Symmetry: C2
Subunit: 129 residues, 2 copies
């Protein structure tokens, strides 16, 4: 019902392949590929504040679902996109050629980003505080 929490990355698949596909340099990818950090979400109804840690980068994004917003991506590009809430537990959007689904089941977020044949999946667990 609420996405709010601090989420510890537990495991991921295809980090290197996805970051290569979007244009990041190999040297940066290899430096970040094994980091398992903590991302944070604060949800207030349709409003979301994200402090995402992925690889060696921390990205802070904010949106209201259903409203267009500029989302900073791993390349540094700020993309214009609309994120929708499906049900109470799935955030969906598409930007460039990437389909993104952020799904909350209990205390586990599964984030799936699909770019052609590459399915980049991150599993993170809410720190219960």
């Amino acid at each position: 019902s609420s996405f709010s929490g601090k989420y510890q990355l537990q495991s991921q698949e295809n980090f290197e392949a996805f970051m290569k596909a979007i244009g990041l340099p190999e040297e940066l990818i290899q430096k970040g590929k094994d980091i398992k950090g903590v991302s944070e979400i604060v949800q207030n109804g349709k409003h979301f504040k994200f402090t995402i840690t992925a690889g060696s980068k921390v990205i802070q994004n904010e949106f209201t679902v259903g409203e267009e917003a500029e989302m900073e991506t791993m390349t540094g590009e700020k993309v214009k996109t609309v994120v929708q809430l499906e049900g109470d537990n799935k955030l969906v959007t598409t930007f460039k050629n990437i389909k993104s689904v952020t799904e909350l089941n209990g205390d586990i977020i599964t984030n799936t980003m699909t770019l052609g044949d590459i399915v980049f999946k991150r599993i993170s667990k809410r720190i219960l505080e």
Copy 2:
């Protein structure tokens, strides 16, 4: 008696001045100055592993107190230094013209980095898992 934990940045002083002094690109200073994320320490005796969130960057470092080590700074530069334990609750390192003191007070960690007349101070709080 253990530094181990995940710590949420609560407040900080003179981020912009310190990052300017060490030469961080201005675009990264402006992006990173308001980000308050989670850093992790794993201590095993004199050995420490760090996953540090500072601004828009995540930095991993690892060393044994009392032994020379090579640590990655906020600019990405690698420096060789020996980290000491002071008074059983302070990690103290001096590299180039910076003195860094990481002090543990219960659930609070205070990182104080002194560079000439600038004191960059971070106060973080243990996440209770």
